[PDB]
Design a protein around this ligand. Structure first.
Ligand code: TMP
Ligand code: MG
Length: 268
């Protein structure tokens, strides 16, 4: 699925989205920019914490500045956090099964979704105020491993900077409580499709890897047949959590190595 939340605040977000703890299992962030708006800014590859924060503050590298300092605070909304999560079976197989391919898959899927999300990118202008599309967003996608559940959760944080290039000028993103014509309003009104779109592209890449899938919930919600999913349901130091995880799995008798070869053969 794809959770939707508003970023707390430059500093706040900065350290959070990169706190190595949120990704100790993975060992890496995987952070890369995204969006026509990001490539249009020369932003490519890894993410510079500072660039990211300034970006959240509303200061682009382009030189444009949408920050509105008012007695210490900034009245410029940072952006929106789109979190795409991977089915327990996969998150597990990806981080505890030693099959990095599944992580790549996860990424690719998010990318395939994030675009469609980008398409809805809009801005406001009057003539009366109206919402005109743009087709671009600036983004920073980070990968985290655990969840509030303290369970493996290969999930990416698609942080959409609250800026959009329209007619040259960098204006803020379309907001509109009323007519729900705002970019974010359309995001809310497509969460299932986009969450499904992300899962759809993943169930295809995984199956091409030789893995099978099964429906477990509505709108798609599937899981990899046979993964001890349940051994991580019903509910410090990252390292202590890792070991725990490793231990909890060995005490299931699942044959990670075999389940893998099982697939390698089934496709190849
Ligand atoms: C800014 C911020 C984000 N987040 C992130 C990581 C969480 O998985 C997520 C919110 O999802 P919940 O668990 O529904 O957003 C925090 O947990 N704390 C923070 O203070
Ligand atoms: Mg997180």
């Amino acid at each position: 699925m794809m959770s939707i939340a508003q970023v707390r605040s430059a500093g706040s977000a900065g350290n959070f989205y990169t706190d190595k703890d949120n990704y100790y299992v993975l060992g890496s962030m995987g952070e890369r920019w995204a969006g026509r708006g990001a490539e249009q800014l020369g932003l490519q590859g890894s993410v510079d914490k500072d660039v990211f924060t300034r970006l959240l503050e509303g200061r682009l590298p382009d030189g444009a500045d949408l920050s509105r300092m008012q007695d210490g605070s900034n009245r410029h909304r940072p952006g929106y956090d789109l979190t795409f999560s991977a089915p327990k079976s996969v998150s597990m197989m990806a981080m505890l099964g030693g099959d990095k391919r599944l992580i790549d898959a996860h990424n690719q899927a998010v990318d395939f979704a994030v675009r469609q999300v980008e398409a809805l990118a809009s801005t406001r202008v009057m003539t009366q105020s109206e919402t005109v599309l743009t087709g671009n967003l600036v983004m920073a996608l980070f990968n985290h491993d655990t969840s509030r559940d303290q369970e493996p959760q290969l999930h990416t944080h698609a942080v959409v900077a609250n800026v959009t290039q329209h007619n040259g000028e960098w204006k803020t993103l379309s907001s509109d409580k009323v007519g729900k014509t705002g970019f974010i309003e359309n995001v809310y009104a497509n969460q299932i499709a986009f969450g499904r779109l992300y899962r759809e592209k993943l169930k295809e890449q995984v199956e091409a890897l030789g893995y099978e899938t099964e429906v477990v919930g509505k709108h798609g919600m599937w899981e990899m047949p046979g993964v001890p999913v349940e051994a991580f349901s019903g509910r410090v130091d990252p390292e202590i959590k890792m070991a725990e995880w490793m231990q909890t799995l060995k005490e299931t008798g699942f044959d990670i190595r075999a389940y893998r070869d099982a697939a390698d053969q089934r496709a190849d």
